[PDB]
Amino acid sequence: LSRLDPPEAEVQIDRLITGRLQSLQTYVTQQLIRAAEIRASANLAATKM
Amino acid sequence: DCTMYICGDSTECSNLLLQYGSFCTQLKRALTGIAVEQDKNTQEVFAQV
Amino acid sequence: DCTMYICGDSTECSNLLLQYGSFCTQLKRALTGIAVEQDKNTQEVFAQVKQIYKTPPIKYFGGFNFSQILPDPSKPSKRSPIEDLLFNKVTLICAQKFNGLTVLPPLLTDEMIAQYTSALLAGTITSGWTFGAGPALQIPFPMQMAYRFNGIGVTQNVLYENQKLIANQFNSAIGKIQDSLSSTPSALGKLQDVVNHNAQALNTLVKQLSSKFGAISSVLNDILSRLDPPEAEVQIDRLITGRLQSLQTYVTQQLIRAAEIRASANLAATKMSECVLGQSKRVDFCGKGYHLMSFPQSAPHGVVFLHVTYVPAQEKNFTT
Amino acid sequence: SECVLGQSKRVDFCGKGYHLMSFPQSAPHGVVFLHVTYVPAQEKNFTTAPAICHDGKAHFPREGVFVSNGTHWFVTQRNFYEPQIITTDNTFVSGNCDVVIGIVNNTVYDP
Amino acid sequence: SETKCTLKSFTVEKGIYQTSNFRVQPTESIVRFPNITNLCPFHEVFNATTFASVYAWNRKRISNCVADYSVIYNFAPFFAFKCYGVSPTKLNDLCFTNVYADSFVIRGNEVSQIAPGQTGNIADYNYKLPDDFTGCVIAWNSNKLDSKPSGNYNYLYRLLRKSKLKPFERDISTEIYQAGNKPCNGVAGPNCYSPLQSYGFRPTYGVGHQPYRVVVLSFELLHAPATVCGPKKSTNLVKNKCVNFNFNGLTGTGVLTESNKKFLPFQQFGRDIADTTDAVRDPQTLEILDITPCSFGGVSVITPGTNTSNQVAVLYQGVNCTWRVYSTGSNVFQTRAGCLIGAEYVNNSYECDIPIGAGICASYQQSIIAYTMSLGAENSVAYSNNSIAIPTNFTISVTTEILPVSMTKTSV
Amino acid sequence: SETKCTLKSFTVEKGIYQTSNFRVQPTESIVRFPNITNLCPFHEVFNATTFASVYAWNRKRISNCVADYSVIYNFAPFFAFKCYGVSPTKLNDLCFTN
């Protein structure tokens, strides 16, 4: 914010926003992928019980 | 959280975030669904009596 | 149809879309895959037999009453009262139709599903369980009752001395189940959630379409009217990238949900083939307690199973 | 595991019809199964009764059911036709001749 | 041939396929403008006399008017038309909600200082602009007329300002010497440094000491009222036809129908939860017209194997036919899946090999025929209270079942 | 009312619901810099018993120290200034090499 000017600040903030958004999306999709398999294993465990 | 991870405590970052606007609501919804489902997941593997 | 969804009637936007490589083909192929898999899913949970049976008109099954399960010809649609209550209890489209987000009708209508379930009921009522293996063999209902009783370690002489009590308890319970289902309106939550999650995801995408990704505006046409072409390529690109990211997120979530739905449908198919056409000795798979039989009933996007069971009630202590 | 190393009575899991055996074979990326099954072919219709009266005593079969070709009565198993003479070893007696419904009157031989 | 293109082969197999959509084309264009056409008082800041300065920005609130190319470009030797929003190549066929032609007459030595990035006198809290500033920059010359001999001292500018000035805000005062440790306050005198800078440019000076008048514009869009744009022939509308409609700067494509609801007396831009313009008011009259786009569709081709024949039957998804299906063919049907042309209809029941939708299936008979579903053979088994059936022969039957286990590994 | 606003509907049935965070605001601000501020040579050339002649003005370059702007407004005879470019009010916030 102190570097450059607010007209020239948003030309660099956008890349940071896109990178952090992409990282968050990857984490969430991986979480869904793991959660589906853990639910399948838990259902098998319930059937065994 | 949506904003505390994507940015700092700066108003122009939140202003740059709301252009997309309806993105992190899906994020929070998916995480809450995963949390509630995995909370439920023990009930049908232990509470059978 | 991604090409019309990203950009409307402006060939310059299409020419910009050609710069991004073969990506719409993947989306269309995955959507056709999930559609055809969901169409194929019902055929292994319903079409388990290849003979539409018909019950005889005179109902004389030892005092048992089956009016709440068999079809009723008074209603023009051949549905039992349980099916009608199921249809009644479970419950802007032009806007999503106007942007290429069309829906497709399924292969099987509800009348054919009702026909399949009625045929399955006739088979499991008048033919015992031999019709799941070979030709249908006629068996009167008390004898099949006696053999099902013999299946769980109770000698068949017990049924023949308490026939009227069995009939009365069965009929009273079948009468009770309708009001028991209708009293709590929150018991149908699975199919309700299945419908509304997909509906809200589609509406979320449609509302996401009108959101500027840091460009001059959201509409492509007025921006094309204002900005001069070879500097507008740097303008209309964030729209394309953001809409493609939204589309990729949507198709990934749809695939994720379809996997779970197909797993549940496979479980339903195994349960139908192992608790209707037979009598399983697996504890807590087809009901609660010692298992006696099951009956299927159709419902909008799915099935409901009536498990008929047996429970000892009063007891006395002795020395062994 | 449940189709080759043993015999399962779960219908439509180890094959079609009553299950008897299974043999596995390999294939590039996966496996194939052959399921030796058993199905009944042709049938005949008969008249049956749930129990037999004798001296005010109701009889019940130890296995199978009673059949009658019109002439006399026999008792046979459930999945194959093989009649045999009704004898006290093949049946057991409990109760009397009024509680059940549809019982016929006949005689049972005792050696 | 389209199916052969999409399959990228020379022989199609069977069944449903897909191609592009229907996309019925529009007919013509309709303009919709107010009938009132006065003349706009432009060029008032362009050719009269010495107009204004940086001390009095031209805050002209231009009312309803009709402005075009003819009044503007009154003098050819302009300067760089520094675009910020709409390009200077097109200034007609779009209407503004308002316009504010700001003006100042300083020399043309520093033309770039008006930029949001390029600073100067603007940086020390003079006349400022926001980051967007969607109007252009018109830095037209003023030499040999405002170039008064020995300097136009009546033309002047402010050297500095003590505190931060918001863009578009007037600060014309005494501007005393509030700075410095000495408490002069503009009265004592030493190192006062008043913002006063009069101009001493003789015409013998360089081109950097010659006046260049600067006028700029400012507007916005996406609003129902308009006040100024060029002329056009607003031809009368067409009822229930796929036309290209333009309404005073907002375009579109669809069919226009008579409204059923009631608008508020000052409301003319109705919409709904679809977030798009459902209806709009006539620019000339009170007439309200609802807008709905021309019909799309889904095109699919039905064929048997090319080993057998090469005839086809084409279905348009989700389009009523009875209807907007262009030309015709042999037979037209009205199934619930949409329109279908090419295949006949017959009440006889058969099994399915080519599914369509809602229990309709088509196949080769010597022609492509269609029918409804047939679940299977009807049967009914006799029943009594004392009848039984027992088998006497048994057959041994063997079936197969295939299952994949491992898929090919990969590395990147 | 906050739950009503964040649910985009006018009725809520039962059960827990997630809403925004607490986020206590900060109290005040503290900067911190070392006490030692060495003096730049502006006052070293300003203050002298004798001064150079106007025939030849000796060049001096001042670099790599702390400015200490108070030394400019320190002397007694203060009746001749013409400040241009960077005012003494806006002096001690900008960075210059020499």
Residue numbers in the entry:
A (entry chain B): 978 to 1026
B (entry chain B): 734 to 782
C (entry chain A): 734 to 824, 846 to 1074
D (entry chain C): 1027 to 1137
E (entry chain C): 294 to 615, 630 to 672, 687 to 733
F (entry chain A): 294 to 391
Reproduce passages from the article.
Some immune escape mutations, represented by F456L, even convergently appeared recently in multiple independent XBB derivative strains, such as EG.5, XBB.1.5.10, FE.1 and FD.1.1, indicating strong selection pressure due to herd immunity. To elucidate the disparities in binding affinity between XBB.1.5, XBB.1.5+F456L, and XBB.1.5+L455F+F456L (“FLip”) spike proteins with ACE2, we determined the structures of these three spike proteins individually in complex with hACE2 to interrogate the conformational change on their RBD-ACE2 binding interface. As we expected, all three spike trimers mainly showed two ‘RBD-open’ and one ‘RBD-closed’ conformations with one or two ACE2 bound. Consistent with DMS results, L455F significantly dampens hACE2-binding affinity of XBB.1.5 RBD, and F456L also slightly weakens the binding to hACE2. Compared to XBB.1.5, F456L mutation does not substantially affect the interactions on the RBD-ACE2 interface.
